Design a protein around this ligand. Structure first.
Ligand SMILES: Nc1ncnc2c1ncn2[C@@H]1O[C@H](CSCC[C@H](N)C(=O)O)[C@@H](O)[C@H]1O
Lengths: 265, 265
């Protein structure tokens, strides 16, 4: 009688850890949510096939409002698993679900999986140099979010890189592209005018991390803003001051302009 | 003609992803390094048994100085795998190895796995609030490194959390404990008087992330500095101001004192 939070990883059903798979295979009931992120290289059927269990998919409302009514009751007399894309506790509010488990008298365990938060290491930028992270959210009605702009400014001022998670509307199947994120940032720049994000800003785009051939591109906004980075999901990164080795990798592997090799120490 | 950088994950031999395992099994040659970090919950023998392949371990010199003489040659006419603890390319020196592969006319692909960088999400602390990361190094002789202290100060000053990787003697397989790390930080504080790390500082300890039974503890230095957190590896976190949700998770899941709900939020 336990509840497992198991990550499925970055792109396809094989991104789950062996540990996660062996445990999931022996669970009595398996639930999952696919609104926190997009696994562009698999399907529900393929995941169900690998795990050998029927997976009941829950919506954001089912989880946030009724996790304790849909999942926990069964976990009191059975072995239950809750699957999520990437790592179950990264850039989600799932951690709070463990408190609900505790209050319901259900023990919970966490099985990690590859997360975009660490996968950005494939961009060649030193992981320790990433500062505060942010999410570029779709404007709605008369509300235009801009907090992510201040995050970039604060990090850049310290010479730190900024990871920008991009918005997603799973039910409407809308996945923000790096292009849309850039357009939104240029608009915020025109408004706040802090010289934080302009056409001359160096940015890095990582699309479909986890696949064998993700798209990794670095360059100036003026050149990348209309570039096709392939299918979603996408992540946008605004580097801070670069180490020479970071620049070399962006040039050699991400096709960045050779001029960035000349860092301004 | 192909080199695969495959992550082994967090703690034991089952932390590799299904993708990594299946690729590793089909490789003609398998190399590995255990100097960036160790896999405390398993052994080289258990890893070999799972992959069903003999594994040649490479030292830091083998990699940094002779990667192109030891690994790439075989990668020219065979499928070769390079196993690393955690997620590949999180360790700062690994990215460059992909440039070496390119230079040698060898294709390289990255198969991700869980990293402690993302696994800390299990502490209940929001991942976006983590700032710059640092490593607490053992002082030696006349050398007393303290840059990690400044990292904490700069992050906390901006309300950000600080992830502290603890020193390790890979060869001797000796791990710095969170207790030793706290002792060191108090020493640095007494030297800098920045008021950054004291007996009243709230800290979080995560031990054996990846294991089904990690130790997650939160509390003030004065109370945790002599506490037993179990077997290595240990990770130390100095959180910044907490969101009430983070505090409630630390209290309910990490046994933090109720006091944090009024002092650190
Ligand atoms: N494979 C991938 N490639 C690029 N971006 C990705 C990605 N997976 C997730 N993201 C990014 O992160 C957002 C979801 S945030 C949830 C992240 C998840 N728990 C994890 O551990 O990765 C997406 O909208 C996208 O911007």
């Amino acid at each position: 009688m336990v509840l497992y939070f198991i990550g499925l990883g970055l792109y396809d059903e094989r991104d789950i850890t062996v540990k996660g798979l062996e445990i999931a295979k022996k669970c009595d009931y398996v639930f999952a949510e696919f609104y926190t992120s997009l696994m562009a290289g698999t399907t529900l059927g393929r995941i169900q096939k690998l795990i050998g269990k029927e997976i009941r998919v829950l919506s954001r409302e089912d989880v946030e409002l009724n996790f304790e009514n849909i999942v926990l009751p069964l976990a009191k007399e059975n072995d239950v698993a809750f699957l999520t894309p990437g790592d179950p506790l990264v850039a989600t509010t799932h951690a709070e679900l463990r408190i609900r488990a505790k209050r319901a008298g259900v023990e919970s365990y966490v099985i990690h999986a590859p997360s975009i938060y660490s996968a950005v290491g494939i961009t060649g930028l030193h992981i320790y140099k990433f500062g505060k992270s942010a999410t570029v959210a779709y404007p709605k009605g008369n509300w235009f979010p801009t907090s992510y702009y201040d995050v970039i400014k604060e990090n850049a001022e310290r010479g730190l890189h900024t990871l920008l998670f991009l918005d997603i509307k799973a039910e409407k199947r809308m996945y923000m592209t790096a292009n849309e994120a850039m357009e939104l940032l240029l608009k915020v720049e025109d408004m706040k005018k802090g010289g934080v994000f302009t056409d001359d800003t160096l940015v890095v785009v990582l699309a479909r991390a986890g696949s064998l051939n993700p798209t990794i591109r670095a360059g100036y906004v003026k050149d990348l803003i209309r570039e096709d980075f392939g299918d979603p999901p996408h992540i946008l990164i605004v580097p801070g001051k670069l180490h020479i080795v970071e620049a070399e990798y962006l040039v050699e592997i991400a096709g960045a302009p050779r001029e960035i090799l000349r860092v301004n120490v």
